[PDB]
Design an enzyme around this catalytic site. Sequence first.
Site: not given
Length: 129
Positions: A35, A46, A48, A50, A52, A59
């Site tokens: 990750e 991301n 959308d 958002s 991380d 998230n």
Amino acid sequence: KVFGRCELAAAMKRHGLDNYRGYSLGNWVCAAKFESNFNTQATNRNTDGSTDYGILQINSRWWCNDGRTPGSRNLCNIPCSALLSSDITASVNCAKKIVSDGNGMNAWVAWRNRCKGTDVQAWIRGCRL
Ligand SMILES: [Cl-]
Ligand SMILES: [Cl-]
Ligand SMILES: [Cl-]
Ligand SMILES: [Cl-]
Ligand SMILES: [Cl-]
Ligand code: NA
């Protein structure tokens, strides 16, 4: 902070992640590797809108507040910046809530695609634990 593999394993173990909800320590270390490459300051946006955050790429759509993900929740009740600290406590506590929510570690796409079903104990091999 960029952790070493065994340094992170020992930190995670002290914070109670070994066999948490049945996931052996190697699972957590493998997830952190893919990750974030063990970097607590990792961020990724991301599609959308958002973002991380941190060593386990938690998230902002669901788990923390970054002030720029409209309509999102903050289920770990923390600012997302707390997830970038060199002290992994906030990340671990939030991860424990995530893994308890029903989907287990499938919540981490890199874990599903790169750790699940592999020999995860290799990630803690050689460490003084
Ligand atoms: Cl393991
Ligand atoms: Cl890679
Ligand atoms: Cl927000
Ligand atoms: Cl599970
Ligand atoms: Cl891989
Ligand atoms: Na949020």
